[PDB]
Structures are given as C-alpha cells and as structure tokens.
C-alpha cells in the first residue's frame, strides 16, 4: 500500500484503536480524489481502504462517522450547492464489524 499524501482529520476510536480519515485532494492532472481510512499501528498510520473509489460520485462528499452496535459507519453523501439543492440527497454508507474490511450499501435521503 503506497497512498498519496493526504491530510489527517476526523479521528475516532474503535476497539481501543485510533483510526483516521485521510483526505487526499491536491489539484493536478495526475491526482484523483482519495478518501482514505487509516489505523494507528505502533508508530505509523496504515491505510486500510480508499472509500471514494467504491462510489460513483464526481465531487467531494460530506463525510460522517458514528459507532453503532459494535460497528463503524462512514457516510459519503453528495455535496449539493445551496442554490442548486436537489429535493433528494444520495449517500453511500460503509459499515464494518472488525475494523479491517468494509461493505457498501448505497442509501438515499
């Protein structure tokens, strides 16, 4: 795993482990939008998944984390403009029970 430089934010704790959402978004002709999930192992951050590749979105999404039923939940919702705001919003939920693998379940708002 060789992830591209990104910023670390949205830190949370699960199963007594520190996790992180790494946002890669430098603008260029060789840089895509990568939304990473990393875990603090010893003294290094280990990238687990690239969450944005598992979506059909074209712009930066709105991200949300919440722990529920011993499970992690990361939401990727389409960013809608304030003037051009649609009556229906789309999100992409990513659950997990172990903290290693994730599944997808696209939802609507």
């Amino acid at each position, epitope marked *: 795993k060789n992830p591209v430089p990104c910023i670390r934010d949205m830190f949370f704790i699960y199963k007594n482990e520190l996790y992180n959402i790494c946002l890669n978004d430098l603008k260029g002709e060789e840089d895509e939008i990568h939304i990473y999930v990393q875990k603090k192992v010893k003294d290094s951050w280990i990238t687990l998944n690239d969450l944005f590749k598992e979506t*059909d979105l074209t712009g930066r999404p709105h991200i949300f984390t919440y722990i529920q039923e011993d499970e992690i939940n990361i939401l990727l919702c389409e960013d809608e*403009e304030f003037s051009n705001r649609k009556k229906d919003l789309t999100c992409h939920r990513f659950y997990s029970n172990d903290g290693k693998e994730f599944n997808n379940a696209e939802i609507t708002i």
Partner: antibody
Amino acid sequence: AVTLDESGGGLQTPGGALSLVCKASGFDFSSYAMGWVRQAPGKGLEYVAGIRNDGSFTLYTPAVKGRATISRDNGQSTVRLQLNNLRAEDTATYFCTKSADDGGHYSDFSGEIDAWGHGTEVIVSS
Amino acid sequence: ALTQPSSVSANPGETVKITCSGSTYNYGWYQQKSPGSAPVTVIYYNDKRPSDIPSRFSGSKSGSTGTLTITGVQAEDEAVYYCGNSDSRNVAFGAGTTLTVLR
C-alpha cells in the same frame, strides 16, 4: 421538444484545432449535464468529454488528454468542444448528448442519456 | 469494461434479451441503425423509456448486470445496440450488440 443542433466539424488539418458547438432547446439547460460522443469509421461509440450542470466538473476520454476543452453557457444553452493537435484517430462523427441528471455521478453521462443530436462529421486529413 | 455480446439473432415475435455487465450503477441503451447515423435512446436510467419508444422495449438491472428486453421483436428493430454506464469511475460504452432478425 428537446433539440440538439451540432455544427463546427469538417476538414481539419492534422496538428491543427477544431471547435464544435451544440445549440440545445426545449429543456432547462442549467439543470442537466452535457457531453459529446464520437464514432470513428468502422468503430463503436466512445464518450469524448462531459461537463456538469454548472460546469465545475469535467471528464475526458484518455485519447484526448491535454487536447480537449468542454464548456457550456447556461444562459445561451450552448455546449462546445475544442480539440487541439489533431490526429487521424480523431476522424469520427460527433454527437452532442444531454443527460437526465446533473452530473454528480459518473453513470449520468453515459447511462442516463435521454437526448441525442443528429451528429457532425470531423475529418482530420492532409 | 462494459461487456455485452457481439451479435444476437431472433425471429420476429420472440423476446430478445441483450445483457451488459461490469457496473453496479445506472444503465442506458442506445440504438443505431446505420453506422455514423444518430443513435436514439431506447432505455435510460436502468428502466426508463422515452415517450417515443415503443412499449416492447424495457430495461432491467440485477447486481452488476443491466438487461435490455425486446418482447416480441419486430423486423424494424434491426440495429446495433450500445450499453452505457460507468466502469470503475470511467464514463464508458459497451462494444455494441448487433440484432439480426431471422428470416
């Protein structure tokens, strides 16, 4: 009465540049994404470039990297395409397409096409 | 990539089924009679049909496979049909499927 009126193609010198346009009518132009589709002689369909409903997101086929520029005028309902450094592989018939969504999803540009133009022919030849 | 069969043959009155695999998102179907001629949308957004397309055309999706359906195919339905979708964050089309009416 959705109409898509293309123009701007024809004989083009290799290594030169061209410009296509698409005068759309019959729908709220600002609410949907637009794009161009080409078809080379004896080949299938290929998506060339797409743009969002407002224009903040553009996509291109790998074969036009660094040579294409897609733009739109929501007040004029015109979407254009510009191709520089023309090669013989760009000789094709180009169709202007309208999407059913805004362009927030990749499958909007090729999976939700609800309107096509009548096409225009580009010939890159010396 | 978006995979669809090369050719499909059918007698008139039969139910034809052209499939397209490779994407879990929204499918479209576009009919082209002559090469270089303007294609016409028959099915878009998985199952929507334009108001000028005959009712025998229908669309479907299951998993990562879109399915176009022509119930009781007619002789005038001869054409090549292209499926469009997003193959791994890339706007793409299928290779095209030619419908040859049997005679």
